[PDB]
């Protein structure tokens, strides 16, 4: 990336390939959510889902999507409708420096940022690793019905 290239490779929170994607449009935000980073489903009120940034003890649901009409501030603010990529292939945010093994199940922590691989169940790492600002961007192959919330 960076110099010696006419175009920057990719930007976080955007789809990479046009292959069987699904975007939910009936969602509401509880706190400030940044593009990329997994989200939870706190509850459902009259059909819509109230999504929050990932926290401890919560199963991720999807990755936030970038729209240039809904959000005119560079991030999703409180009390704003948002799009969530429930299924597809999207660029996410990571706190890594080296690309993991191919088709390895990623792990999420902190505010929905990827901390490492070598998981047991969940989404997988596609082929992609680019540099962004001060850090890297990872490509995540989101699949629906991947994380099952544990029984109490």
């Amino acid at each position: 990336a960076y110099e010696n290239l006419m175009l920057r490779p990719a930007c976080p929170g955007n789809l990479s390939d046009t292959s069987t994607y699904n975007i939910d449009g009936a969602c509401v935000a509880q706190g400030d959510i940044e593009f990329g980073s997994a989200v939870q489903v706190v509850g459902i009120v009259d059909g819509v889902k109230v999504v929050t940034a990932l926290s401890d003890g919560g199963t991720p649901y999807g990755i936030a999507f970038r729209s240039q009409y809904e959000h005119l501030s560079g991030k999703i603010l409180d009390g704003e409708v948002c799009n969530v990529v429930s299924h597809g292939r999207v660029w996410a945010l990571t706190s890594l420096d080296e690309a993991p093994s191919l088709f390895s199940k990623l792990q999420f922590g902190s505010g929905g940022v990827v901390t490492g691989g070598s998981g047991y169940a969940g989404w997988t790492f596609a082929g992609g690793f680019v540099k962004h600002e001060d850090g890297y961007i990872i490509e995540v192959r989101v699949k629906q019905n991947a994380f099952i919330v544990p029984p109490p």
Partner: protein, 157 residues
């Protein structure tokens, strides 16, 4: 005087590496034959997926490797050779990573509906093969002339 006659003949049902159904399928382009030739009805392996560019290098299955997808039959990209249709080295391959396709089989008995698919070292279906896949059977089981064909359901890896 004379008695007239009328005859009948039926077409075949499948052809190796041919899409079987119109269900949800995902065919991935931007794959390259890194080395050797790849048959239309055989599984493939991913040698390397480039990070910045995006091309995935595709080879033929060997021992102890994870299958990725099945080659797809096309009248333009493929090159006719060995009295057959193959994908040559240094050319784009249509890999189906999801859907129902007609595979090449080495088995002799019809399989069950829902069960795991086992391949051999060559990349063709075998009832007691060694390499293990996450794909499942679909039910179709026919034969084109002297070639045995089987239908499988592919799941994204």
């Amino acid at each position: 005087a004379q008695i007239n006659a009328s005859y009948q003949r039926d077409m075949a049902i499948a052809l190796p590496g041919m899409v079987a159904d119109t269900s949800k399928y995902n065919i991935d382009g931007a794959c390259v034959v890194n080395e050797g030739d790849v048959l239309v009805g055989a599984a493939v392996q991913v040698v390397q997926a480039q990070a910045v560019d995006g091309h995935k290098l595709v080879k033929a299955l060997t021992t102890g490797t994870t299958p990725y997808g099945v080659a797809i039959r096309s009248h333009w990209q493929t090159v006719n050779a060995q009295n057959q249709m193959i994908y040559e080295d240094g050319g784009a391959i249509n890999v189906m990573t999801s859907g129902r396709v007609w595979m090449l089989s080495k088995s002799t008995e019809a399989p069950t509906f829902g069960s795991a698919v086992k391949l051999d070292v060559d990349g063709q279906e075998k009832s007691d093969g060694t390499i293990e896949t996450t794909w499942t059977y679909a039910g179709g089981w026919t034969k084109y002339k002297d070639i045995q064909l089987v239908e499988v359901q592919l799941h994204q890896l």
